[PDB]
Structure formats: structure tokens, C-alpha cells
Amino acid sequence: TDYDKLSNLTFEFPDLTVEIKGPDVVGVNKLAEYEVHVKNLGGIGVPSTKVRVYINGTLYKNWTVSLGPKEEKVLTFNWTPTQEGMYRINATVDEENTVVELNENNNVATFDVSVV
Ligand SMILES: [Mn+2]
Ligand SMILES: [Mn+2]
């Protein structure tokens, strides 16, 4: 029943997607909690796929998850910045593209965070 700008209404293929949620502004040396929302919009499940989070292009954390049809999982990770500046958080699912999906172009999320 969930529908948003990242989810539109086929059941013969899975469709992995990712979205990042959390503070867009954080203070140096302060614990920040983010959430990676990984969903399978398709009618076929995904026994195993990799999810990765990058901060300014450098890998930060990795997960191996499974997602049944129309299932969503919330992955979490904490981040305590040490320096200030504009950081770009990226999240990817099936980056190695080992899963044939309805869309391979909605497998990447971008989220900007300002550390002050
Ligand atoms: Mn996809
Ligand atoms: Mn894929």
C-alpha cells in the first residue's frame, strides 16, 4: 500500500531501492543516528544482496540483507563526525548488479549532511 516518489505501482521481478534518513545538520564530535531504508518493490524476493553506505565516496558500513516481495527493512548506523564541512552520504543496494530488477537506476541514494 506504500507509495511515494520512490515507489510507484508486474510481479515477475524484484526491485531493490534505498533511501537515507537522518539529520541533515550535525555537530562535530556529536553522535548522529541515520537510517537506511531498503525496500523490494517487486513480487519476487531477494534471498541475498549487499547494501553499502559511503561518506564522501569512502565506504563506511556494509550489510548483507534479504527482502521478500514488497518488504522493507530499516538498517541503522551511527556516525560521530570529527571535522566540519559538507559531507555527502551515499547508500547503494546490489551495486555489483547480481540481481535482475524492474529498475537498476533507483539503487542509489544521496544524502547531504552539514557538520558544524
Ligand atoms: Mn532497483
Ligand atoms: Mn540489480
Give the ranges where the chain is alpha helix by DSSP (H): none
Q: Nearest-5° angle of CA 62, CA 77, CA 90?
A: 60
CATH at 3: 2.60.40.10
User: Count of domains in the chain?
Assistant: 1
Q: What span, in angstroms and rounded, lies between the C-alpha atoms of 116 and 106? A: 30
After which residues does a break in the chain occur, C–N more than 2.5 Å? 9
Detail the residues annotated as belonging to a binding site.
15-16, 94, 97, 99, 101, 103-104, 106-107
Query: Does residue 114 contact residue 86 with C-beta atoms inside 8 Å?
Result: yes
Structural domain containing residue 13: 1-116
2: left (phi over 0), alpha (psi -120 to 50) or beta: beta
Residue whose grid cell is 510507484: 8
Detail the residues annotated as belonging to a binding site for Mn(2+).
15-16, 94, 97, 99, 101, 103-104, 106-107
Helices and strands: H and E segment counts in the chain: 0, 8
Three-class secondary structure of residue 8 per DSSP? coil
Please name the method used to determine this structure: X-ray
Q: What share of the chain is helix, strand, coil (3-state, %, to 5)?
A: 0, 55, 45
Looking at all shown ligands, the one closest to residue 106's CA atom is: 1
Report resolution (Å) to 1 decimal.
1.7
DSSP 87: E
Distant-in-sequence, close-in-space partners of 73: CB < 8 Å, separation ≥ 6: 37, 38, 39, 65, 67
